Symmetry: C3
């Protein structure tokens, strides 16, 4: 059960891997203003970090999606639905929770697996 740390800071690591499993930090918007824009940005970050860890979006197991405002549900979904891999959509939960900054509309927390 060797642990690998990716993108380590004094506070957290962007991803942590162990025995084929990959746990991503909550990805948080770096660009965009609207729910649509920020969801695309968050998912683009997930894409990079998965690639870093030897994974991709078609190997995601689990996604918890935190929305600041549940009124943004359909907009977030439109972007999510277009990003997800057909036939390989992950387990998902979406709940409403305020994030570390007021301007952040969406945060997504991913669990994935490496390719064999």
């Amino acid at each position: 059960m060797d642990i690998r740390y990716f993108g380590t800071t004094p506070r957290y690591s962007e991803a942590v891997g162990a025995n084929g499993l990959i746990f991503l930090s909550g990805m948080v918007p770096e660009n965009g203003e609207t729910a649509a824009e920020q969801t695309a940005d968050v998912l683009a970050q997930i894409d990079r970090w998965l690639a870093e860890c030897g994974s991709d979006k078609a190997h995601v197991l689990d996604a918890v999606i935190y929305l600041r405002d549940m009124g943004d549900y359909a907009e977030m979904n439109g972007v999510w639905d277009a990003w997800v891999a057909a036939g390989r959509t992950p387990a998902r939960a979406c709940v409403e929770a305020r994030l570390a900054r007021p301007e952040w509309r969406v945060e997504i927390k991913i669990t994935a697996v490496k390719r064999d």
Copy 2:
């Protein structure tokens, strides 16, 4: 690290399994109005999905319980306590977060394991 998908939709799968591990989507109420009724319904869904993936409630590792309103803590607990397998109770966390529909008072997110 082969991935199995169960009850796959264009948006999510109801369950994803990898290397003996099982991740359920957040289960949301399909019947009932009060927290007690909706908790029962959610836990029955969990039973059926765990059965599908070759698991059961005695093999649940982890459960995150989201309540729309923390005022329903005790009422939810009454159904939860009666449901869990004695001596094989999982790790648990319960926090307050609004869900995708305003009528949903509870949502439960399960991690479990395949029987050998």
Copy 3:
């Protein structure tokens, strides 16, 4: 995929283990009033349960931190930062959600691995 249960009660287990993975229940404050005091207490409980399970803070994969009030973010961080294992910081998510009692300012949910 044999399951080990630690600190089992009728409602939940403080920790459960399977295939070298460890899932802790949400740890909530037992002592302290301020966000700083409560965080240190929660992290001290996490230290104790990890040790029970053959693990420690340098083998934590994932941490979800729920704050009652996101106004407590920097104060929580101060304690968290001084607690983590340098170079071995885990995946992290922090999100605002009310907890089971109103005096509780912070709850932390840990996923970890056994040492070899």
